[PDB]
Amino acid sequence: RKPIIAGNWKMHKTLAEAVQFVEDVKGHVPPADEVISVVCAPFLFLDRLVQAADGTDLKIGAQTMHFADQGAYTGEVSPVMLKDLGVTYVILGHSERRQMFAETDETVNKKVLAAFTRGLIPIICCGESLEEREAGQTNAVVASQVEKALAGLTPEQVKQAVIAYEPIWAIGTGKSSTPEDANSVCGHIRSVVSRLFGPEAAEAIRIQYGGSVKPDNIRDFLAQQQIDGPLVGGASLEPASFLQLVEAGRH
C-alpha cells in the first residue's frame, strides 16, 4: 500500500503564491514510485498549477467538485471540467462542507461514483464529532459514512479510492488523535471495506488520517499499520513543511 499524502490548502493563497509554492516543491517531492504527493488547491489556481507541475510528480487536486457533468448548478465545477484540466485528485465530503454547505452522505456518494466515472481519484472524508466521540458512536458514524459513500462501486474501483478518516474535533484544533487510536478506527474502516468489498479491496485501499497532523508527527501516524498517509491542511501551506510531510513516506 503506497503511502499518499495530500495537502488541503483550503481557502488560502493567491495565484502567485500558489505558483511559487509548486515551483519550490515540485523538484524535491519524493519519487512517484515511492509516495503520492498531492496539493489540493482552490479552483482558481488549478489551471496554472497543473502546468507548473509540468512533468513533476507533484499531483494537483481540487477541494470539491459537483456530482454532475454539466448543468444548472450556479457556482459548481464538474468532474468533466476538472479532468480536462489535468486535475487527478478531489477531496470529497470534507466536514467543512458537510456541516456548512449541506454535503449529505448522498451527495458524497454521488460524487464518488462521478469521480470514478470521470477518472479522478477521490479522497473521501469521514469522521465523527466531539459529541459522537464522547457518546461512543465513533465506529458507527465512521462506518455509515464509509458504507454510504462507497455505495455503487466495484471492488476494483474501491482498491483505488482513498479514505481520509478525520475526527472533526482534530481539524485545525492542535489536538491530534493518537496513532493507536486512529489506527483502530482506520482498521475498523478497512474492516468495513472488507465486509462490503472483500479482502483484496480492503488490503488495497489506502486509508488516511487527517486532523492536526504536523511534520513532527506524520512519522508516528504513518508507522501505524492501518494508516497509509495523512491528509494535511494547515501544515501544507508552507513549501518547506509540505516537503517535510511528503518525505515522511520514507522518501
Q: Which residues bind a second copy (CB under 8 A)?
A: 8, 10-16, 42-48, 62-64, 66, 68, 70-78, 80-82, 84-85, 91, 94, 96-97, 100-102, 171-172, 233-234
Q: Is 111 annotated as a binding residue?
A: no
Shortest reach from residue 134's CB to a second copy, in Å: 23
Q: Is 110 annotated as a binding residue?
A: no
- The smaller minimum CB distance to a second copy, of residues 27 and 172, is found at 172
All cell numbers assigned to 184: 483502530
Beta bridge partners of 38: 6, 59
Q: Is 198 annotated as a binding residue?
A: no
Shortest reach from residue 45's CB to a second copy, in Å: 8
Q: Is 119 annotated as a binding residue?
A: no
- The smaller minimum CB distance to a second copy, of residues 20 and 139, is found at 20
Shortest reach from residue 77's CB to a second copy, in Å: 5
- The smaller minimum CB distance to a second copy, of residues 48 and 219, is found at 48
Shortest reach from residue 98's CB to a second copy, in Å: 10
Instruction: Judge contact between 91 and 6, C-beta under 8 A.
Output: yes
| Strand (E) or helix (H) holding 141 | helix 138-149
Helix 239-247, helix 15-25: angle, nearest 10: 40
Measured distance CA(168)–CA(148) in Å, rounded: 18
Told to judge if 251 belongs to the known catalytic residues of this protein, a careful annotator would answer no
Q: Is 27 annotated as a binding residue?
A: no
Instruction: Judge contact between 193 and 208, C-beta under 8 A.
Output: no
- The smaller minimum CB distance to a second copy, of residues 99 and 178, is found at 99
Q: If DSSP codes are grouped into helix, strand and coil, which group holds residue 3? A: coil
Active-site position among 96, 103, 132, 166 = 166
Q: Could you count the other beta carbons within 10 Å of the beta carbon of residue 68?
A: 15
- The smaller minimum CB distance to a second copy, of residues 28 and 97, is found at 97
Q: Is 212 annotated as a binding residue?
A: yes
Contacts of 176 (CB under 8 A, 6+ apart): 170, 211, 212, 213, 214, 217
Shortest reach from residue 30's CB to a second copy, in Å: 25
Active-site position among 94, 96, 128, 247 = 94
Cβ burial 132-167 (10 Å sphere, 16+ → b, else e): bbeeeebbebbbebbbbbbeebebebbbebbbbbbb
Residues forming the annotated binding site for substrate? 8-10, 172, 212, 233-234
Q: Binding-site residues, please?
A: 8-10, 172, 212, 233-234
Residues with catalytic roles: 94, 166
